[PDB]
Structures are given as C-alpha cells and as structure tokens.
C-alpha cells in the first residue's frame, strides 16, 4: 500500500482561489501543500499498515478476576456473568463505534497460595470450568448432580500446565451486535397502575449470554487453601459500520450516567506559547 | 445556482430563495426492501403519498440566554393523521426521513446555530439509581426538550421525577460537544444563509423493527454564537421545523393500541 507522491510547483498569479470556501455545507476542502507554496520533487515510502482496525484490536486484555476456596465444610464455588462492561480499557475502545461484528477468543490463568503451612501439606489440585447457556439449571452445591455436563461443554485444567485457549463464532440473534439501544423492552398500556409495563431504559434481551461456573475437584485437605482465576479476551475478523466520539468522563454504571469528574480542562493564558 | 431550490408537496406552498447545498447521510438514498433480505412472509402495504408529505411542528422562540433543543423520531409524528394511525395498528414498520429548518432575520443581526443528527442518541438521568428513567418522560411528543447549563441531583426520594438532565457542553452523554462534527451536520450563519436541509435513510441492525419501542434517529440543536442586535431592550425571533418521511411500509395487523400517558 503506497502513498501519493509530491510534484513540483512554481509561483502563480490569478484569482483562481482554492483557499476560500464555506463550511456551512458540511464539507472539507481537500487542500495540499503544493497549491499554496513552492515545492520540490519528493517520493514517499511511508504506509498506513499500523492503522487498520484488525491491528488496532490485536491485543489481549484482562476482563475479570475470580476467587474460590477449598475446605471441608468459605465459599466452595462461584459464578460470573459474561459482559465486557466491567472494565474501561476495552470498553472505551469499543464505544468508538455503534455496531460491530467479530469472532472471539478466550484464555485462562490460575494461581494459588497457602494460608498456613502449620497444619500440614497438600497434593496437587485440579480445577473445573463449565459453560451454562441461558435457561439451564443452576448448580446448588459443589457436589450437585448438575456437574455431569452431558450436553454443556466443560474444560479441565491441571495446575502447572500452560494456559488453555478457546475460540467461538458470532452468536448474535440479530445481524450484528448493538452497543446502544434507545428504547424499552415493554410498552405500558391503559388499565395498568405500576407493575405492568414497568421496565428499565436501555434494557437488553431477556437473557444475553448466560454465565460460567467454577469449582475444585479434589477432596478437602485438612487445611485451607486459596486460588484465583483470570480471563483474557482477543477479537479477530472485525467489522464496524458507524463511528462516535470517545468518552471524556469517568464511567458510572452500564449506562451513560455521570455524577463526578466534571472539570478535566485546566487554566491557561490566551497569549502564551 | 445552488442558492435556489424547490421542494413542496401536498397542497401547501412556501417561499425560499437562499438555501445552501443539500446533504446526504453517508451518500445513500432510501429504497424498499429486497426479496433476498426479508424476514417476514406476509404481503406488506404501501400507502405511498397517503403518508409521504410535509408536516409542520410547533414554533419556538430564540432568546439571548437560550441553551438548546432536542427531539426524537418517529415519536414526534405519532399524531399526524394517517401516518400515526398506521403506526399504531401494524406491529412492524420502516421508513426514512427528511428534515428542513426555517429561520430568517435582517442584515444587522448576527449569530450562528448548529444542526446535528445522531442515531441511537441516548441521554443521562438525574438520580443515583441506574437507568431509572420512566417511559412517559422519554417520549414527550412533538414539543421536545431543552438542555441545561449545570448538573443537579434530586432529593424527593418519595416522589422522584425520573427525568433527564442533559448538559450542553457534555452533549448530554459525557462527551465533548466540539467533537460532534463527526456526525452529519449543517451550520447556519445569519450573514450568509437562512435555512438547512438534510436527507436521512433508515439505519438499524435489522431490516425492520417495532416503531413503538425503538427510536432510530435523534436531532439536536445548539447555538454556537449568541444572538445580538443594536436594540438594547430585548430581541426574539422564531424557529419553525418541518419533517417528511419516505418509503413507508408495515406488517403485522391486529387490533389497535392505546398507550398509557400522564
């Protein structure tokens, strides 16, 4: 992908003025240096390869941190709701555009540590992860019958092995993902006081993407241990169709509300370089 | 040349002699649905000129300390005759829009205005509770609303207003106003021109949607330079707005709807 070269130009004398225009039409004059000053012949070699969206999104970033324990009887299993709104690093970049379409990739990291080695020592550990589509039953215990996963995909990871990795396709029910929605899920009709038609502004579908569940398989050691899990995400094969200006104030809730940080610009003189 | 244009339909007539060039959003012209991209199966209806005509909205006053105005579509047109009637009987609908703003003044006046068009134009609330705004206040009709110069939280927890509180320099969504020129826009300067025109197609993630629940396009107006005149007492001038849709069709006919209002 080359770039246009610059040709030579000399002096001029006329009333052919391309430097005058009107912005009221909402158009920009495509001016170039050669039309107002003398130039020498030059040949360019620079390119715009590092400006593509695919290279703009070719980075992994953290999304969530999870905690879990292992003990005889404090919580033995946990759940997390899937969403990209919990962090600002990727959210700010994604809010550059209105609609998007891409595949997705996943990766997991595991860590563990003692609380006290006074009671004894424990063997290696094994961790379990399962995926719960919307509408599926929720486990009620660390030893529930629901962990059989006869249809729900699940992954097993061994402590000390390299991280796992997963890929999934586009799974939207519409033709593309939507980052904004100016409307309601319900319409309030007559003959209904408070409880019918009441819905939150900007609400999404009844259930978006479900959640994930985690537990440890090994039986309780005579002493307590602690562990954590981290998640990283990586898009690929991206497309976008509409731009927007970026955020400039601290986020507050999933919506566009704001209640603080309303003075980002400092003072300065008018005639200071 | 481009200083003169003609646009007039349906037994009305107006005078125009100083319009600038026209604008098309992303260079796309409205069209009907193609057979290779439909999703329903029933035969639709096409009112044609029964709904594709110019409608006139309420008038407003521009003052020295005015802040701005904002409207929503297709909410504003729900009460305009056959278009509104069809919008309530059928479950699904689709349409484009056309806009035209009218404003005139003398030579010794000076000032400037900006016009912006925004799809999926969300706004902030006014209370601690997240996303607590109510339906009846976010769909007020033709009158629209106005921006505020500052942010203030409510205290009547027993009877909350559950209303918006946009800020002009934040554009009502926590972003700088100067960067909004990435949207389609036109600028009116009283010394050069007296009107604006725009063309808007249907933009959404789906070929068709429910018109009662989701609003596609929003419109905002912000003064950039304050109005002034040698008159030291006071001065006011009117603003009038016109809208006209094109390429209408609907599906899913049943009994009528009657939304709740307060």
């Amino acid at each position, epitope marked *: 992908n080359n770039l246009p070269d610059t040709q030579s130009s000399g002096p001029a004398h006329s009333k052919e003025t391309p430097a005058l225009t009107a912005v009221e039409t909402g158009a920009t004059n495509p001016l170039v240096p050669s039309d107002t000053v003398q130039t020498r012949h030059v040949i360019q070699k620079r390119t715009r390869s590092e400006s593509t969206v695919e290279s703009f999104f070719a980075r992994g970033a953290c999304v*969530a941190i999870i*905690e879990v324990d292992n003990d005889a009887p404090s*919580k033995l299993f*946990s*759940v*997390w709701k899937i969403t990209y709104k919990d962090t600002v690093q990727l959210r700010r970049k994604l809010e550059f555009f209105t609609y998007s379409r891409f595949d997705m990739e996943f990766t997991f990291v595991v860590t563990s540590n003692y609380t006290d080695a006074n009671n004894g020592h424990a063997l290696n550990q094994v961790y379990q992860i399962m995926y719960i589509p919307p509408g599926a039953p*929720i486990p009620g215990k660390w030893n529930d019958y629901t962990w059989q996963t006869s249809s729900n995909p699940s992954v097993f990871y061994t402590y000390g092995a390299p991280p796992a990795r997963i890929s999934v396709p586009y799974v939207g029910i519409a033709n593309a993902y939507s980052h904004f929605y100016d409307g309601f899920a319900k319409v309030p009709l007559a003959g209904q006081a408070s409880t019918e038609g009441d819905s939150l502004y900007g609400a999404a579908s009844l259930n978006d993407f479900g959640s994930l569940a985690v537990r440890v398989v090994n039986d309780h050691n005579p002493t307590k241990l602690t562990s954590k899990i981290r998640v990283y995400m990586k898009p690929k094969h991206v497309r976008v169709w509409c731009p927007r200006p970026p955020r400039a104030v601290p986020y507050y809730g999933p919506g566009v509300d704001y209640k603080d940080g309303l003075a980002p610009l400092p003072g300065k003189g008018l005639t200071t370089y | 040349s481009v200083r003169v244009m003609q646009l007039t339909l349906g037994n009305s007539t107006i005078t125009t002699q100083e319009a600038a060039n026209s604008v098309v959003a992303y260079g796309r012209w409205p069209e009907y649905i193609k057979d290779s991209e439909a999703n329903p199966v029933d035969q639709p209806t096409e009112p044609d000129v029964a709904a594709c005509r110019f409608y006139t909205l309420d008038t407003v006053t521009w003052r020295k300390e005015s802040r701005g105005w904002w409207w929503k579509l297709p909410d504003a047109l729900k009460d305009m005759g056959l278009f509104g009637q069809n919008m309530f009987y059928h479950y699904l609908g689709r349409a484009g829009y056309t806009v035209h703003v009218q404003c005139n003044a003398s030579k010794f006046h000076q000032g400037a205005l900006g016009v912006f068009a925004v799809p999926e134009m969300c706004l902030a609330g006014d209370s601690t*509770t997240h996303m607590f705004t109510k339906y009846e206040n976010a769909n007020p009709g033709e009158k629209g609303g106005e921006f505020k110069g500052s942010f203030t939280l409510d205290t009547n927890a027993t009877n909350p207003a559950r209303n918006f509180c946009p800020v002009d320099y934040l554009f009502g969504s926590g972003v700088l106003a100067g960067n909004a020129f990435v949207y389609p826009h036109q600028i009116i300067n009283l010394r050069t021109n007296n009107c604006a025109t725009l063309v808007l197609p249907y933009v959404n993630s789906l070929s068709i949607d429910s018109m009662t629940k989701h609003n596609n396009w929003g419109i905002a107006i912000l003064p950039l330079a304050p109005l002034d005149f040698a008159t030291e007492s006071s001065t006011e001038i009117p603003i009038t707005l016109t809208i006209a849709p094109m390429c209408c069709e609907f599906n899913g006919l049943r009994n009528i709807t009657v939304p709740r209002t307060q």
Partner: antibody
Amino acid sequence: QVQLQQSGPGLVKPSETLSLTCAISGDSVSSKSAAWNWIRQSPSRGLEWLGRTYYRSKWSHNYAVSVRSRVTINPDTSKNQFSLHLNSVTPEDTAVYYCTRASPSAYTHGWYGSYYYGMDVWGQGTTVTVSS
Amino acid sequence: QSALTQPASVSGSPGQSITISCTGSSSDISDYNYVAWYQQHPGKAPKLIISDVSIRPSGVSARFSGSKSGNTASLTISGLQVEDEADYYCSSYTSDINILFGGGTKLTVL
C-alpha cells in the same frame, strides 16, 4: 458455632444520645469474608435496615439514605466488638434492635467483589424505650 | 418509594401444597436474582430459610423450595404440616446499596 451477644442501655429519654455494642464470640471482627449489619423491628413498621461496616484492607462504612446524617457506627478491635451511636432520639425509636452477620452470595463483580444478599446469624434482640 | 407486595395471609391443612408470591416494582426485583427469604416465630428471632432464589442452606428440608425471575418470586411448599405455620418476608438488594423488605405475611395458630 459462632454466636453473637447484645449489650447496651435499654431505656432512653428524648434528645439524648443512644449507643449500643454487640459482641462476637468464635470469630474475628477483622475477618476479610464477613460483614456486620444493624436492624430494628417494630410492630407498626416491620423490618427495616439501617447500616453496616466491614474491613477490606481498610475500614469502610455504608449508611441508609434516610438517616445517613443521624447515624454513626464505630468498631472496637480490642474487644472484638462494634458500637452503634444514634442522636436526636425521639419516641418513634422505641423498638427492638439486633446485631447480625452477612455471608457472601455467588455472582461476583460489579464493583470488584461479591454481593451480600442478607443475613444468617441473628441476636436475641434488645429493646429500647423512649419515655417522658 | 417502591415497596414489595405480599398476600395478607394464607392457611391450609396438613399434607397439602402451598404457594406464596412477593412482587414489587421493576427496580427491586427485575434486575437480577438478588432475593432471599426469612421466617419468624412468636417470641423468636428471624431465621433464614432460602438464599439466592433456590439455594437451600444446611439443615433445610427439601419441602421448602421456590423460584422465578422478573417481577415476582414464588415460594412453594409440599408435604404441609402444622409446624410449617410461621411468618414469611421477602427481601431484595438493589444497585443503590440498599436493602428492602415486604409488608410481611401473617400466619399464626394459638
């Protein structure tokens, strides 16, 4: 297993200051996976929540909006106790009071952490009376 | 202020099945499954029965169970017995860092 205990004056006069202290047995107040709440019950009004406090690498507080400025809660590391303070006492304050514990639910995140739906351990209930 | 709604009172005979519902505004129940239940007896402090819609702590019989999402949460009981008579209250936790309780349900026998 872990059990609570209630203490403090049972009678109050209008315009005075009321303070109560609850004692923990078998657990540590600085626990990083627990929370402590104050509740009062009255037949005319039923159950209602006042405030809470917890320690996560630092001390923190949470108070109800309606009585935010009238309430103050302070801990006591040495006693393994936490104390309540209420001002502008009035006849309406005559009701039963408990100290309780909260356990963590499992959906995690939001503002980084987990959610504490409710309570599992309850005290005996200490009565406070306003007269004269 | 939005407040939760409960039926005034219900009674039955041993061996039957019982259903109770708690309902309120959207801001209180429609967000997520942040729902819990408590029980009380004459002269007794409240006791937990159910947390998180359907999770039964230790010592809770399989008879008491109920679940739903949206604008209403339902509690269902099977194998009804005399000792099951008690007072019932629904609870919720909102995004505004607040806790709410319903008007309560009154069931008592001398």
